């Protein structure tokens, strides 16, 4: 007998691949200042001198 | 060396996330007794009651 | 702008299916009086799908014996249509010239066991095709895939995505 | 089960997304940005090293 023709349970289908967000409390994450500089520093003046 | 340059392109953004994630990991170390060690909480002397 | 550099610049940087009470005002009046503990005029069933699984008003155990083919045998001391393939005229006739009335009662129940299994297989397939459309209908999906939205809406959460400082 | 909507946030400055400056102090985020020392004997030392 081919599979998926075998008798299966009548249940609510799977919710495994669902995306959840989280309620995090007030003091969990720190306050962040100083945006980091992604850009590399340039040393044209040092090698020019 | 094209992918060395790819590794030499996105390195300080990686250090920026390595700083903010470490900052939040330091935020996890908040206990309020490591900080001010005198947190006077509550006392009461001997009453007539 | 030179073509030795244009190939490398982008290289270095790549940039009728349910059986509930369909009136949406008798179901509410049923619960408004049910909390008090009162019956109502109209009837209300639980939700389900339609369709009846009706056996024994369908394929029966066949009658391969006659009206007296067992007691007279007691005296003389004796490709598929539904589930069985159609046999040829000459090949099956000598096969039924071999068997005994001790095995006719076996054969009747074997063929009934084939018939009931096929008549359950196809209804089971139709029932799965109905339940797969029930569960989609009861979950907001349409089929086969002034309003105000609640916070439990797809895309209307209250937890806004906070951005990192480097972005 | 009974979800409510947060109405509206009148945001003060520095309490906002993209409210971060390069001029802000890095209390945490331990990576530093260092002052280039341009001294001419130190220029010769940097050229040699």
From Swiss-Prot, chains A, D:
Coiled coil: none annotated. Present with 3150 molecules/cell in log phase SD medium. This is SWI/SNF complex subunit SWI3. It is found in: Nucleus. Interacts with RTT102, SWP82 and the N-terminus of SNF2. Component of the SWI/SNF global transcription activator complex. The 1.14 MDa SWI/SNF complex is composed of 11 different subunits: one copy each of SWI1, SNF2/SWI2, SNF5, SNF12/SWP73, ARP7/SWP61, ARP9/SWP59; two copies each of SWI3, SNF6, SNF11, SWP82; and three copies of TAF14/SWP29. Involved in transcriptional activation. Component of the SWI/SNF complex, an ATP-dependent chromatin-remodeling complex, which is required for the positive and negative regulation of gene expression of a large number of genes. It changes chromatin structure by altering DNA-histone contacts within a nucleosome, leading eventually to a change in nucleosome position, thus facilitating or repressing binding of gene-specific transcription factors.
From Swiss-Prot, chain B:
There is a cross-link at residue 15 (Glycyl lysine isopeptide (Lys-Gly) (interchain with G-Cter in ubiquitin)). It is found in: Nucleus. Involved in transcriptional activation. Catalytic component of the SWI/SNF complex, an ATP-dependent chromatin-remodeling complex, which is required for the positive and negative regulation of gene expression of a large number of genes. It changes chromatin structure by altering DNA-histone contacts within a nucleosome, leading eventually to a change in nucleosome position, thus facilitating or repressing binding of gene-specific transcription factors. Present with 217 molecules/cell in log phase SD medium. Component of the SWI/SNF global transcription activator complex. The 1.14 MDa SWI/SNF complex is composed of 11 different subunits: one copy each of SWI1, SNF2/SWI2, SNF5, SNF12/SWP73, ARP7/SWP61, ARP9/SWP59; two copies each of SWI3, SNF6, SNF11, SWP82; and three copies of TAF14/SWP29. This is Transcription regulatory protein SNF2. It comes from Saccharomyces cerevisiae (strain ATCC 204508 / S288c) (Baker's yeast).
Swiss-Prot record, chain C:
The keyword Transport does not apply. The keyword Nucleus applies. One of its GO terms (cellular component) is chromatin. Keywords: Activator, Chromatin regulator, Nucleus, Transcription, Transcription regulation. It is found in: Nucleus. GO terms for molecular function: chromatin DNA binding. One of its GO terms (biological process) is regulation of transcription by RNA polymerase II. Interacts with SWI3 and SNF12. Component of the SWI/SNF global transcription activator complex. The 1.14 MDa SWI/SNF complex is composed of 11 different subunits: one copy each of SWI1, SNF2/SWI2, SNF5, SNF12/SWP73, ARP7/SWP61, ARP9/SWP59; two copies each of SWI3, SNF6, SNF11, SWP82; and three copies of TAF14/SWP29. Belongs to the RSC7/SWP82 family. SWP82 subfamily. Present with 3180 molecules/cell in log phase SD medium. Involved in transcriptional activation. Component of the SWI/SNF complex, an ATP-dependent chromatin remodeling complex, which is required for the positive and negative regulation of gene expression of a large number of genes. It changes chromatin structure by altering DNA-histone contacts within a nucleosome, leading eventually to a change in nucleosome position, thus facilitating or repressing binding of gene-specific transcription factors. This is SWI/SNF global transcription activator complex subunit SWP82. It comes from Saccharomyces cerevisiae (strain ATCC 204508 / S288c) (Baker's yeast). The lineage of its organism: Eukaryota, Fungi, Dikarya, Ascomycota, Saccharomycotina. The gene is SWP82.
